[PDB]
Each structure stands twice: as structure tokens, then as C-alpha cells.
């Protein structure tokens, strides 16, 4: 090995020596390294064995012979160089593991071989350089290394193919090449283009990433930890998925390594390039290296991704899974210490935060190497004055550190500026009909906007923080550059900055820029997700139920003897010293007054009461009617079913046996409907009817009916009793216990466990017991792409001014960027005067003044972009929120008040927030793109012939994410919140599931929900590794042609043009692919505008304020209403109506259901546009009045008063038009004086959401005092305790005014004369009662 032949010729030729050596070395020496380690990945994932196949035995067979043949070179040699000796013996040796491993990774089940796939490549190409010595240097020891090589080339042609197998996830399958390129998901992204994309196509997932097998052997593992006992969930999770942190860390360090290589390659390129009479290839050479690594680096990076998300997604899945079931397992004073929705925040939140925090997580070492390997690189080039430099990043630590507390800060009072705003938003649909007819519209337009601006207060605020990020971002690499570069250029003037020592430096600060900002937003993320694995360790730990502590024996029925149970470890018992047996098929009734334990009992026979003491011997499947009812939000017959088999025959007999059909008959589509929550809402007696039948249906042995009949009515009641639970209905022979406060079933109960206080008190049958005349006889005694035209939408709510100066000004950002690296290259080509350069303090005054410039410019282009951003939501918001109050009651009864909080919610939260920083990361990445481009064509025109191909490439690539991403990120949005929902329903009924011992089922359900959201989410990401493959494989070729272009032209080139066009190409790689990602992520976010710029067309309410024929101050004179041939459209449900109402007449209106009774009331108000009618009060016509005129003229008492949250007095006056005084005398002859004096705020008592707090019967009183305090004289009466009060005080004072009263009760409306009867849209009888009768 010496220089003149390898390194300072033009042939550049390896020493004989070199090639028998060392080239032969490196691949023998590759396996036998690989080889053991290779063992346990071999034992430890395992796959079966593959057939025998031709490829299999093609490649075994050519691993004998090549065996053979470099064994044949030691018989020749046999036939004086110590070399001739151990090389050919140490390659066959190498070569017999390579066909033996072949062999044992058939045996294993490894259809590809990355191992088998590296090692021939590297063989390749050390054969390759003794190839090109041995045609060079030209028979006797030749003829045997070109049998070789050819051989070895096969040999890595076959294993690039794919073996036999011992919708699939393809990765299974998928080649070592595949693999790393993640090709096996391209044909899936044209499909994304093709067609749309729905969870029909979306491949199942592997076996690995399916719930059922990552949530256990977590489980497991929690077990075990917690069998050893203080729980530590840490080390539970270290070791569930350990083996995955450790591959991310070993590609970590790779990349690591692998991404300084870089700047290496740069300088010795710029080296190359400064010195002339250098052999050409050097260059060539060079070029060619920087891209070889380069690819590496990208490709080991985004394994080092995928392994991370792929983490990821198993951690959160099986988090997920261990929540789920632990939440059937906790004892009910641990459900109690932890809410509900704290609980599906454990699942969601913390989950969430776990998966995306393991895609950065590693950095927290990673950036620190990455820091200290780069400083020194840096010493290196400059020497002591990177110090200054590290300072700059010093200065760094605290800003990002308050910056990211001070994010928090705002986050967290905007979270709660949005809530609050929301829950405002979901009284006013909530109740809209009562604010269209109080003409309230615009008093809540104030209120939601004076919270919108609280809420923008901080968005303004968080802007600013948020411009010092982006700064930090876009300045961090010049801000340690400059420094840098003046301590060096200032403290010896001897130091001369060349390209070498100036572009080879950016490039390494170009580097430092990410892992420096991202370690404190890392520090960060763990820090929220170490709150959050705390509240999952507490989770957790949470106690466990003994299904022992209650005996289950399957098929005298129930026994309990002296037993005492509680709610709580601590809590005094409940049920104290309890004995009884109940016998098979027998009626048995809980008696007792209100929290005797009558319900505690069916609890304690459930295994849900804490058992302190006792023995429960509950015999066969027990079926729990609760008495708060559990509905699924499936549909009526599955919620009936509970996932059993059905059967026409006993389903059809259990419907009407609980007197299902009427409520059947009235929802929408049967037995199919949606019930639920989410779906039609149903009444209390409907629940406890559906809750019933699912009981009888599941056909248990021991029924617990904990208060079955609360909600029916009493006809309905007894029907039930008949045919279901009495000793003649569906439950005949089955063992019911029933808990229950009603006697009149109690005479046919078999026997009667009467209680008081916890303690069995003369259980017996019910002649019996009476006859004892004890504590029973005391009992009875007590009673496709979005369009540009959206886009355009947003730039005109952003402020066209402002979003033209943002474009402008980031404009001269990357011009200053450009013309600073431009200077610094033109600095490093400055002549040298003795030891000291030309003009050095001139040119660092330009760097620094054009730095400046470009660091004030990206701030105020941070700073435009997010106040242009507020600017957007307050405008966006302002119109929905206008035409939303502005369109009619129809809308908002046809379209789902979802859909309305979706819009206000979640359309609201990307655009005002999210919207800003993705035009913000685009634009910087685009003009990033844009600018090393420039920078190429400027030192290397030529290059030119680069930018369709390669730009080619990127377009398809971009739409084939484009397309196909926001399809899956679609998908995953749709997928996640079912798997809450489903989690949240579980929450609620876990009584239920345990009763129906249907854990498993609902276990099965919450793994099949994560499995298709993980089926949105694992193509989502491998789509990002896919377009990050291929953008940073065209970034790679850009910087192999930038090299390579200014090698060929390196006489007419600058070293310094050379350093700056190879450093932005360095940058342009990561740029490239981040690009596309923020162009999908913009695609997706202008549909949120798009979104909320739909009802800004739609039909609106005729105008409120009409201002041209406006009313007089006392429009009703006298209330004279005259309903002149009035029809209604909504074919006519009113029709042919010529009535007229007098000035202060009482008129009622009476009729059926299906008549247009309440329609009438509509009619006076407008809510329905008249179809055919000249409705007239006094001489004025309503038609032509401004709506909220009449609606302010007119008030009306609805069927269920709607109290909104806020104080009484907003209540009331929302618009504080009346004075104090008014209200006070209002509310005192609504007899309210005395309520109302007695609440500790006054006038101020903060009434909840529907006014919980308050009583039905206060609600409506104090709808009366709105109404009483309107004083206005036509007034309309909605009638459905407090019925005598409320129709009292509307027949005391109001007598003077013109009331309409519609009532389904004929006592009250025979008071009321001038009758109205409507049968079915017309006027059936026009008279006074008197005339009725
Ligand atoms: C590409 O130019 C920019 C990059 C980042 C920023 C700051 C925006 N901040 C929200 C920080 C983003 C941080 C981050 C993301 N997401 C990021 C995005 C894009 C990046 O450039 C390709 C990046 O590397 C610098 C980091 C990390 C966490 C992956 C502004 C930029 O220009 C205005
Ligand atoms: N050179 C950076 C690259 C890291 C990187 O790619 N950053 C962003 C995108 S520029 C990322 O992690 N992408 C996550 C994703 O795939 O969504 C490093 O040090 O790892």
C-alpha cells in the first residue's frame, strides 16, 4: 500500500497485496461477525420452514461449487505467498456458513435475506475492484476469480427474490429490498390515487401489531411486577417492548454517525476542488461517496422511524387493551375515585401522547451526541471559537425552555377558553327553538363572541411565542454561525476563512439546527407523558374484584349467610349480617324505604359490593336488570340480543311481553333504530323496557330486577308483571329476585325479604308477614383535492394585505438567506495578504447586517402569518356563527347538531391554531426546495439537465401521497373516536357485562376497534416512510449531481461555489420530503375551511330587522290576531284557517295529535314561512315585519322550559333591558320572591346546563317570569304539581292580554272561552265551550 498507485495516479489501482487481502476480508470477515448474532434472530422469531424449491436448492447448489472453486485455488497454490495460503482456505470457510446459513434460514422460514443480501453486495463490489486490477493488469489463478465473481454475481441476483410462503399485510411477505425501500405499499399509493380508499382495502394487521397479541403479554407483565410487591410501570413497559427501543437505538446511532459523514466528504470535495493538478477520479470518486452514504443515512433513518411508530402503535394499543381491562376488573370505589372521562382520557390522551412521543423519544440522547459530535467537527474546523458558537446554543436552552412552559400556559387557557365556548355552543343548538322564539339570537351571538375573543387573546398572545419558535428554527443555524465566524475572523487575523473552513461549518450548524430545538421540545413531551404514565400506573394499581368472593356454582338458587358487605375498604357496611335462601323458580321481592339496601343486595349478589364478611352462593347464569338503564348505542334488536343468536320465535315473544311493540311502533325504524346517546334518545321507561327484554332474552336461571318498573307507567307495569315476571309470564321457572317499593305485586310474590338499614328484618311470604303484623305491617302502613377556490377563501380571511407582506417579506427572508451564503462564498475566495485576508471586516459586517436582516424578517413573517391566522378565525368564526343563527329552525332540526359542534369544535380548532403553523412549515420548506435549486443552477447551470427527471419523479410521488395519505388520515379520524365511544358506553354499563358474564365479548370488541384504527394508522406512516424513501433518494440524486457537476467543472468553479451548492443540496434532501408532507397536511386542513363556508348559502330566516316597515312602539294595540286563510307547509299540516282572536280574549286551542295545534304557534312566530296565509295582528301584517320585531312583540310559554347556564337575571333579561326593579316585580308574581331571595347570589345564582340545579317546577316559573316580564299583550301557552301555580298566575295579570293556550288537558282550556278544536288542520268548532257543549 503506497500512494503512487492508489491515490496520485490517474489509475487509480489497488496493490496486489491490498486486493488479496483486505478486500477479500471484508466479506468473509461480514459473516462471521453477523453469523452467531445472527442465531438469535434466527431461534427467536421463527416462521416454519419454506418447500423445496428451484430457487432455494439454485442457491444452495452455487454455494457448494463456489465453495469448491475457492478451495480449488488453495489445491493450486498446494500444487509460495504466505497470501496464496489463507485467503482462499479462509474464503471457501466464509463461504460454507453462507450455503449453511441459506440452508438454516429455509429451515427458519425467511422467504428473503437482508443478510444474505449485504454480504453478496459487498462481496460484489470487493470482487468488482479485484476485477477491474485483474482485467487492468491483462489465466493460471485469474480464470478462478472470474468464476468466482460471476458465481457471486447470481448468487446476489437470486437473493434479491423471494422465497415461497410457509388482505395480509404485504411487510410479511415484502423482500429485504422492499423492505428497506418500503415498496410493498406503493401499489396500495397508486390505488390511493385510483380510487378511493375505505376499510374495505386497508390490509389486516400483521399478527404482531393485533391487540389480542400485544395486550396480553403486557398483561402478563403487569402481573407479574405487581405480584412482586411498589408497582413501577416503567419497567413494565421496558420490558414488554424493549427489543424494539434497542433496534431504534442501534439505527439511531447509525444515522447519527452516518449523517456527519457529510461534511466530512464536503471537505475533502472542497479540498479536491481548491487544489488543482488532483486526479480527476479523486472527485468522481468523492461525489460518489457523499451519495452512497447519503442513501445509507436515509435509509437506516427511516427504519430507525419505522421500528419507533411501529413501537409506538403497540404501546398504545396494548395501553389501550390494558385499560379496557382493567376497567372490568376494579372495584367500584376505584371506578368511583376516578371519573369516567378520566378514565377514557387514560385511554385516549395518554395513549395518544405515548405513541407520538416514541417517534422523537430517542433524541434525548440522540441530540446530545449529535450536538457534541458536531462541536467537534466544528473544533476541528475553527477551532476555540466554536466556544462562542456552543454559547449562542446556551443562550438557547433558557428561551426554548420558558418558551415551551409559556406554550403550555397558553395551550391549557385556551383549552379552556375553547371548552367553555363549547359547552355554549351546545346550549344554543341545544334550545335554539327557544331562542328563535325569544328572539335571543343576537344576545348569544354576544355572549359566544365575547368568549371567541377571550379565547383569541390567547391565540394573540401564543402568536408571538410562536414567531419566537419559528425564529429559532430559521435563525439557530445563522445565529451560532455568525458568532462563530466573527470570534474566528476577530481574535487572529492570521485565521483565514476558506471554503473548507466556512461551508463545511454551515453545513454541520445546518445540521445542529434540529437536534438543539428538539431536545427541549422532547424534554417536554416527556414530561406530559410522565404525568400520564403516572395516572396509568394509578390506574393500574387499582384493586381487584374477586368473582370468588361470591360462589358461582352452575347448574337453594341464592344462599347468603351472615353476610356483610360494603362499597368500600374503609366505609362502615352496608348490608350487615344478611341471610337468606332464596329456591329455585321462586318470586322474591326486596322491601324497604328509601337507601334501606334493597339495591345494595342485587349489588352484593353480582360481586359488586365489597364482601367484609360472609358466604354467597349464587346458583347458575345471573341476568341484572339495573335500575339505572344501559343502553348500547347499537341497534334496538342488538341491544335486545346483547350478542346472541337470534330467534324469531322468543325474541318476537319477548318484545311484546314487555310492551315494546307501542315503542317499537313510534321510532323511525323499528326494532333497527339507533338507541342510545348518539342516536334517538329514549324515555326512562323505554330504557328500563329495552333493559328488561335483553334480560328476559339472555334466558338466565337467577334474574336481579333492581327496581324494573320504576319509569313504566302503571297499566304498563302491571302488563309487564303479567307476562314477564309473575308466576304466569316468560319467567315462570326461573329464580327472579325483585327490588321494588309498589304492593301491588307484592300480594302474588312467593316471598318478601323485607329490610331496614342493611339487616334482614322478618323475611317471609306476604300472608305471613302480614299476619305477623310486624315490621311489613309497619311498612304498609307507611304509604377528491380540494380546490384552489378555498385556498383563495382563506387568503381573503387572512387579510389579503396581510398575506401578500407575509409572502413578501419571507420572500426577502430567503433572498437575505441566499445572498448571505452568496457573500460568505464569495468571502471564502477572498486573496490572502500575507497571512492575513483583503477586506475581512467589511465582509463580516455584510454577513452579520444581511443575518440581522433575515432574523428580523422571519420574525415579522412568523409574527404576520399567525396575526393574519387569528385574523381568519375571528372572521370565520363570526360568519358561521351568523348564518348559523341566522338559518332557520328547519336546518337545524335536518341537520344533526354533530355536525353543527364538528364545525364549531374541531373545523374551529384546525383552522385558528394548526392552519398557521402548516403555511408557515410549507412555505419555508417550498422556498427552502426553491432556493438550493437556485443556488445549484447559479454555481452549476449544467445541472439544469437534473430538474425535469428527477422533478418528474417528485410530482408523482407527491400525488401519490397526496391522494392517497389524506385517505388514510381520513380513515384514522373516523376510526379513533369509536374506539372512546365504544370504551365510554363500556364505562357505563360494566355492571351489566359482569352480570351477563360478557366480559370477553366486550374485551373482543375493544381489540377489533384498535385493529381498525391501527389499520388506518400503520399505513398512514408507512405512507410517510414510503414518500420520505422516495423524496430523500431525489434530494440524495441532487446532491450527486450538484458534486458531480462541480467536479466536471471544477476549473472554472470556486471552491467556495462548490461548499455552498453541496450544503444546500445537503439541506434541500430533509426539505424535500417535508415539503409534501405539509402540502398534504394543508390539503387536509383548507377542507376545515371549506367546511365552515358551507351554510353561508344556505336558506336563511327572512330578514330580523327590516327597517322600512317597521312597526310602531305599541304595535299590539289591543292583540287583535286574524289567521286569514292561513296554510302551513310543514302536504299541509295547517290548511283552510279564517279565524280571528279579539283584543284580551282568552282562546285555547284543543285538539289530537297529528293536528296542527303547536304548528298554530309557529304560525304566529314565523318559524315556518307561511305557504298560504295573511296572518294579521291589529292592521299590521306579520309577513312583512322584520322577525325578531314580531318575535320581541310576542311571547311564548313552551312545553319544557329552557333555562340556560349563567346567572337567572341573564336568564331572564339576556339583553339587561329591564331594569332591576322590573325584574324583582316580575319574579315576585311569578311566586318565585321567595326562592328567589333565598340563593346567596342574589339575582346572580349560577344556574348549571338546562338548570339541573333547579326544579322542573321552578324552570317553568321561571319562564313565566320571562314571559311576565316581556309585557307584552299576545301571549302563547304550551301546557304538557306546579300546574295549579302556573295557571293561577297566568289567569291573574294576564288577563289583559291576548293569550293562546294550547293544552292536552280539556280541564284547564275549559276555562278559557272562544274554543279552537282542530282535527286535522281545520277548523272544526269556532266557539265559546258554552257553545261547545
Ligand atoms: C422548514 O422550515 C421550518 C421548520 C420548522 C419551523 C418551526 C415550526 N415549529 C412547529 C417546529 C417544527 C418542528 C418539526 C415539526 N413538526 C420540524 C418540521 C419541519 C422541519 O424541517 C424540515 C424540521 O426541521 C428543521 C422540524 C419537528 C418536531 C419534526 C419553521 C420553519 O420555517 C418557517
Ligand atoms: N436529520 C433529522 C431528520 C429527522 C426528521 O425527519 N424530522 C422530521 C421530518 S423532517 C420527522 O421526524 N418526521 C416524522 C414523520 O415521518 O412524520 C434527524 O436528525 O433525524
Avoid at 493450486?76 to 470457510?93: D, H, K, R
Avoid at 439537465?945 to 388520515?969: D, E, H, M, N, T
Wanted: net charge neutral; glycine share 6%; hydrophobic share 45%.
Amino acid at each position: 500500500w503506497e500512494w503512487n498507485v492508489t491515490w496520485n495516479t490517474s489509475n487509480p489501482d489497488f496493490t496486489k497485496c491490498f486486493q488479496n487481502t483486505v478486500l477479500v476480508w471484508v466479506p468473509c470477515s461480514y459473516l462471521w461477525v453477523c453469523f452467531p448474532f445472527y442465531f438469535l434472530y434466527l431461534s427467536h422469531h421463527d416462521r416454519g420452514y419454506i418447500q423445496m424449491t428451484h430457487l432455494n436448492k439454485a442457491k444452495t447448489a452455487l454455494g457448494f461449487l463456489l465453495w469448491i472453486v475457492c478451495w480449488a485455488d488453495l489445491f493450486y497454490s498446494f500444487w509460495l505467498a504466505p497470501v496464496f495460503l489463507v485467503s482462499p482456505t479462509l474464503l471457501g470457510i466464509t463461504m460454507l456458513l453462507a450455503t449453511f446459513l441459506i440452508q438454516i434460514e429455509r429451515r427458519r422460514g425467511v422467504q428473503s435475506s437482508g443478510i444474505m443480501l449485504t454480504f453478496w453486495l459487498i462481496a460484489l463490489l470487493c470482487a468488482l475492484a479485484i476485477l477491474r486490477s485483474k482485467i487492468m493488469t491483462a489465466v493460471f489463478r485469474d480464470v478462478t476469480f472470474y468464476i468466482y465473481f460471476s458465481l457471486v454475481l447470481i448468487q446476489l441476483v437470486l437473493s434479491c427474490f423471494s422465497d415461497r410462503s410457509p388482505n395480509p399485510c404485504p411487510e410479511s411477505s415484502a423482500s429485504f429490498l422492499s423492505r428497506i425501500t418500503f415498496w410493498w405499499i406503493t401499489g396500495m399509493m397508486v390505488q390511493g390515487y385510483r380510487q378511493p380508499l375505505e376499510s374495505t382495502d386497508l390490509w389486516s394487521l400483521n399478527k404482531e401489531d393485533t391487540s389480542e397479541q400485544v395486550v396480553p403479554v403486557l398483561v402478563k407483565n403487569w402481573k407479574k411486577e405487581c405480584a412482586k410487591s411498589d408497582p413501577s410501570l416503567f419497567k413494565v413497559l421496558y420490558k414488554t417492548f424493549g427489543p424494539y427501543f434497542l433496534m431504534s437505538f442501534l439505527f439511531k446511532a447509525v444515522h447519527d454517525l452516518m449523517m456527519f459523514a457529510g461534511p466530512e466528504i464536503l471537505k475533502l470535495l472542497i479540498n479536491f476542488v481548491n487544489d488543482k493538478k488532483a486526479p480527476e477520479w479523486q472527485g468522481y470518486f468523492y461525489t460518489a461517496l457523499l451519495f452512497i452514504s447519503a442513501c445509507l443515512q436515509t435509509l437506516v433513518l427511516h427504519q430507525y422511524f419505522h421500528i419507533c411508530f411501529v413501537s409506538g402503535m403497540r404501546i398504545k394499543t396494548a395501553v389501550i387493551g390494558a385499560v379496557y381491562r382493567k376497567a372490568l376488573v376494579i372495584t367500584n370505589a376505584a371506578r368511583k375515585s376516578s371519573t369516567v372521562g378520566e378514565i377514557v382520557n387514560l385511554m385516549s390522551v395518554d395513549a395518544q401522547r405515548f405513541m407520538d412521543l416514541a417517534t422523537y423519544i430517542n433524541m434525548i440522547w440522540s441530540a446530545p451526541l449529535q450536538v457534541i459530535l458536531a462541536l467537534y467537527l466544528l473544533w476541528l474546523n475553527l477551532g476555540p471559537s466554536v466556544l462562542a458558537g456552543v454559547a449562542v446554543m446556551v443562550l438557547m436552552v433558557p428561551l426554548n425552555a420558558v418558551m415551551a412552559m409559556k406554550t403550555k400556559t397558553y395551550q391549557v387557557a385556551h383549552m379552556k377558553s375553547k371548552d367553555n365556548r363549547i359547552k355554549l355552543m351546545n346550549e344554543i343548538l341545544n334550545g335554539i327553538k327557544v331562542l328563535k322564539l325569544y328572539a335571543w339570537e343576537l344576545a348569544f351571538k354576544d355572549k359566544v363572541l365575547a368568549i371567541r375573543q377571550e379565547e383569541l387573546k390567547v391565540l394573540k398572545k401564543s402568536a408571538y411565542l410562536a414567531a419566537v419558535g419559528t425564529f429559532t428554527w430559521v435563525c439557530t443555524p445563522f445565529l451560532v454561525a455568525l458568532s462563530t465566524f466573527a470570534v474566528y475572523v476577530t481574535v487572529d487575523e492570521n485565521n483565514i476563512l476558506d471554503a473548507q473552513k466556512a461551508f463545511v461549518s454551515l453545513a454541520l450548524f445546518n445540521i445542529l439546527r434540529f437536534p438543539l430545538n428538539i431536545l427541549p421540545m422532547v424534554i417536554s413531551s416527556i414530561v406530559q407523558a410522565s404525568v400520564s404514565l403516572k395516572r396509568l400506573r394509578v390506574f393500574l394499581s387499582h384493586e381487584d374484584l374477586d368473582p370468588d368472593s361470591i360462589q358461582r356454582r352452575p347448574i337453594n338458587s341464592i344462599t347468603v349467610k351472615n353476610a356483610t358487605f360494603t362499597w368500600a375498604r374503609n366505609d362502615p357496611p352496608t348490608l350487615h349480617g344478611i341471610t337468606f335462601s332464596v329456591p329455585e323458580g321462586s318470586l322474591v321481592a326486596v322491601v324497604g324505604q328509601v337507601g334501606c339496601g334493597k339495591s345494595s343486595l342485587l349489588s352484593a349478589l353480582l360481586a359488586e359490593m365489597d364482601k367484609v364478611e360472609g358466604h354467597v352462593t349464587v346458583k347458575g347464569s345471573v341476568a341484572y336488570v339495573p335500575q339505572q338503564a344501559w343502553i348500547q348505542n347499537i341497534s334496538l334488536r342488538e341491544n335486545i340480543l346483547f350478542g346472541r343468536q337470534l330467534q324469531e320465535r322468543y325474541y318476537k315473544a319477548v318484545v311484546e311481553a314487555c310492551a315494546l311493540l307501542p315503542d317499537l311502533e313510534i321510532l323511525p325504524s323499528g326494532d333497527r333504530t339507533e338507541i342510545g346517546e348518539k342516536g334517538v334518545n329514549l324515555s326512562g321507561g323505554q330504557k328500563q323496557r329495552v333493559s328488561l327484554a335483553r334480560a328476559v332474552y339472555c334466558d338466565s336461571d337467577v334474574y336481579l330486577l333492581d327496581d324494573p318498573l320504576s319509569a313504566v307507567d302503571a297499566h304498563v307495569g302491571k302488563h309487564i308483571f303479567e307476562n314477564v315476571i309473575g308466576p304466569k309470564g316468560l319467567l315462570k321457572n326461573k329464580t327472579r329476585l325483585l327490588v321494588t317499593h309498589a304492593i301491588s305485586y307484592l300480594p302474588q310474590m312467593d316471598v318478601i325479604i323485607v329490610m331496614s338499614g342493611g339487616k334482614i328484618s322478618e323475611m317471609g311470604s306476604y300472608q305471613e308477614l302480614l299476619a305477623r303484623d310486624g315490621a311489613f305491617a309497619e311498612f304498609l302502613r307507611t304509604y377528491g383535492q380540494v380546490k384552489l377556490s378555498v385556498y383563495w377563501d382563506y387568503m381573503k380571511a387572512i387579510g389579503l394585505f396581510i398575506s401578500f407582506l407575509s409572502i413578501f417579506l419571507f420572500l426577502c427572508n430567503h433572498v437575505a438567506s441566499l445572498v448571505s451564503n452568496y457573500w460568505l462564498s464569495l468571502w471564502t475566495d477572498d486573496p490572502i495578504v500575507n497571512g492575513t485576508q483583503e477586506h475581512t471586516q467589511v465582509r463580516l459586517s455584510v454577513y452579520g447586517a444581511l443575518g440581522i436582516s433575515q432574523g428580523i424578517t422571519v420574525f415579522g413573517y412568523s409574527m404576520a402569518v399567525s396575526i393574519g391566522g387569528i385574523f381568519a378565525s375571528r372572521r370565520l368564526h363570526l360568519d358561521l356563527l351568523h348564518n348559523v343563527l341566522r338559518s332557520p329552525i328547519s336546518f337545524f332540526e335536518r341537520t344533526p347538531s354533530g355536525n353543527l359542534v364538528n364545525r364549531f369544535s374541531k373545523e374551529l380548532d384546525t383552522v385558528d391554531s394548526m392552519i398557521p403553523q402548516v403555511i408557515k412549515m410549507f412555505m419555508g420548506s417550498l422556498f427552502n426546495v426553491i432556493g438550493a435549486c437556485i443556488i445549484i443552477l447559479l454555481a452549476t447551470p449544467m445541472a439544469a439537465v437534473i430538474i425535469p427527471p428527477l422533478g418528474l419523479i417528485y410530482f408523482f410521488v407527491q400525488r401519490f401521497y397526496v391522494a392517497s395519505s389524506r385517505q388514510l388520515k381520513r380513515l384514522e379520524s373516523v376510526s379513533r373516536s369509536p374506539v372512546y365511544s365504544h370504551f365510554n358506553e363500556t364505562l357505563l354499563g360494566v355492571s351489566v357485562i359482569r352480570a351477563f358474564e360478557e366480559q370477553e365479548r366486550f374485551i373482543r370488541q375493544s381489540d377489533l376497534k384498535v385493529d381498525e384504527n391501527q389499520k388506518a394508522y400503520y399505513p398512514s406512516i408507512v405512507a410517510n416512510r414510503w414518500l420520505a424513501v422516495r423524496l430523500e433518494c431525489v434530494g440524495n440524486c441532487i446532491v450527486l449531481f450538484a458534486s458531480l457537476f462541480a467536479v466536471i467543472s471544477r476549473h472554472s468553479l470556486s471552491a467556495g461555489l462548490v461548499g455552498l451548492s453541496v450544503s444546500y443540496s445537503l439541506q434541500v434532501t430533509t426539505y424535500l420530503n417535508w415539503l409534501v408532507r405539509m402540502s398534504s397536511e394543508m390539503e387536509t386542513n383548507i377542507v376545515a375551511v371549506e367546511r365552515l363556508k358551507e351554510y353561508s348559502e344556505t336558506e336563511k330566516e327572512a330578514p330580523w330587522q327590516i327597517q322600512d316597515m317597521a312597526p310602531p312602539k305599541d304595535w299590539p294595540q289591543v292583540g287583535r290576531v286574524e289567521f286569514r286563510d292561513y296554510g302551513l307547509r310543514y302536504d299541509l299540516v295547517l290548511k283552510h284557517i279564517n279565524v280571528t282572536i279579539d283584543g284580551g280574549e282568552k282562546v285555547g286551542i284543543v285538539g289530537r295529535t297529528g293536528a296542527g295545534k303547536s304548528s298554530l304557534t309557529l304560525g304566529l312566530f314565523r318559524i315556518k314561512e307561511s305557504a298560504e296565509g295573511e296572518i294579521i295582528i291589529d292592521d299590521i301584517n306579520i309577513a312583512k315585519i322584520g322577525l325578531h320585531d314580531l318575535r320581541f312583540k310576542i311571547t311564548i310559554i313552551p312545553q319544557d322550559p329552557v333555562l340556560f347556564s349563567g346567572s337567572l337575571r341573564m336568564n331572564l333579561d339576556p339583553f339587561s333591558q329591564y331594569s332591576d326593579e322590573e325584574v324583582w316585580t316580575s319574579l315576585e308574581l311569578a311566586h318565585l320572591k321567595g326562592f328567589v331571595s333565598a340563593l346567596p347570589d342574589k339575582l346572580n345564582h349560577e344556574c348549571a346546563e338546562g338548570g339541573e340545579n333547579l326544579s322542573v317546577g321552578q324552570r317553568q316559573l321561571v319562564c313565566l317570569a320571562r314571559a311576565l316580564l316581556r309585557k307584552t299583550k299576545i301571549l302563547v301557552l304550551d301546557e304538557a304539581e306546579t300546574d295549579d301555580l302556573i295557571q293561577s298566575t297566568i289567569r291573574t295579570q294576564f288577563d289583559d292580554c291576548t293569550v293562546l293556550t294550547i293544552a292536552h288537558r280539556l280541564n284547564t282550556i275549559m276555562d278559557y272561552t272562544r274554543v279552537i278544536v282542530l282535527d286535522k288542520g281545520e277548523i272544526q268548532e269556532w266557539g265559546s265551550p258554552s257553545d261547545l257543549l
